[PDB]
Design a binder for this molecule. Structure first.
Ligand SMILES: Nc1ccn([C@H]2C[C@H](O)[C@@H](CO)O2)c(=O)n1
Ligand SMILES: Nc1ccn([C@H]2C[C@H](O)[C@@H](CO)O2)c(=O)n1
Ligand SMILES: [Ca+2]
Lengths: 221, 212
């Protein structure tokens, strides 16, 4: 009944800035940003910061928390307003896929998670979506493509204290998973429907010609 | 439509030996999957370095428990299902104690509870207990039964540990002074049996299930 699109992209690619521009267009368009605020406020502690400072200790914990929260937030917004509008479209800021096959996954491929952790993570992640996740099936994906050099430079522009330590080699590994997943679509997941899902890739390396393609996309959905 | 009872007790109190005599179906603790996570023992990992894997182990432990019990009761005349420990003992006894022992920081403990609460706010209402059987035993006895069972990981557990777990048990099942976030439990019947020392227990049990 409700068209669900996911906005994907590397760190600082411009996910949010795009999300916001979208909101101001159709009153039937709502958006669900990442609970990033909670991640940074867990009883006066920053679990996001805790992971960047000692990844091989809090990666598991942070990725568990991050996905759990995301499912809650999104499950919440699809049972809210817009649940009456003629053309109900909901934009998600990143999904439970990017969370597992990009960020989490990369952490494991960097020894920042042992076999025990990674095993548990996937076991957990699979179950979570096998229940209250089918309602979160995506109908499309918007890919915000940008060079890892641009993301690195945009990290300073946003000036988030925790992210200021991120090396290029890191954004480079995340950037590859992105390409390999939504560009060449060679990356495979356990959720087969995604193979049939439409991907709109936009070059955001450099403000209305994007709105253009977007509409043509949502219509062909 | 199905009576759900939970068998509670300290480590090595005799939970399983009692569960078997009872067998009415039973849902054993997922101890198996706990010791086998891709050729690794996450249970062993916790006892060896508690302040590093307590969180991870407790998250996994409860998740698995909910799964096992959920598919369990998912059709006879007198349907009774016995649970080997519950999601309560998991959070208000074991996990809880680990946090009261610095084996979990504020970050972990906060996340745990947040998670635990959500988990049962969904597919947990079907797991509401109708009663609880308390297997009471002295910490000294549990310690001695640890050797009798001879589980490699548990052989390092000191008395002070068992004693703590023991008090959380008494506080929660005998004294009824440990409040939780699941109020119905305050109305739930508790059958306490002294298992410190094999058919007189079956006796009380039946009288219990009838008064349910
Ligand atoms: N699954 C996720 C989601 C987000 N982040 C991080 C990257 C950014 O620093 C911040 C913003 O999304 O969160 C992460 O490591 N893993
Ligand atoms: N939430 C739980 C449940 C059980 N155990 C331990 C105690 C025993 O050593 C073994 C069997 O229950 O697992 C634990 O540490 N935490
Ligand atoms: Ca703060």
């Amino acid at each position: 009944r409700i068209k669900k699109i996911s906005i994907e992209g590397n760190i600082a690619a411009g996910k949010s800035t795009f999300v916001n521009i979208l909101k101001q267009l159709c009153e039937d368009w709502e958006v669900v940003p990442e609970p990033v605020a909670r991640w940074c406020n867990v009883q006066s502690t920053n679990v996001l910061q805790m992971m960047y400072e000692k990844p091989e200790r809090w990666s598991f914990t942070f990725q568990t928390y991050a996905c759990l929260s995301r499912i809650r937030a999104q499950l919440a917004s699809l049972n809210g307003k817009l649940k009456d509008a003629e053309k109900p479209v909901l934009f998600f800021e990143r999904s439970v896929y990017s969370d597992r096959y990009i960020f989490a996954s990369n952490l494991y491929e960097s020894e920042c998670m042992n076999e025990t952790e990674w095993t548990i993570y996937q076991d957990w992640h699979d179950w979570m979506n096998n229940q209250f996740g089918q309602s979160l099936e995506l109908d499309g994906i918007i890919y915000l493509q940008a060079t890892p050099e641009t993301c690195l430079h945009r990290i300073y522009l946003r000036g988030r204290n925790e992210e200021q330590g991120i090396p290029l080699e890191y954004l480079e590994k995340l950037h590859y998973k992105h390409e390999s997943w939504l560009l060449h679509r060679t990356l495979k997941t356990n959720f087969d429907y995604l193979q049939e899902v439409p991907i709109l890739t936009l070059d955001v390396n450099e403000y209305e010609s994007l709105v253009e393609k977007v509409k043509e996309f949502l219509s062909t959905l």
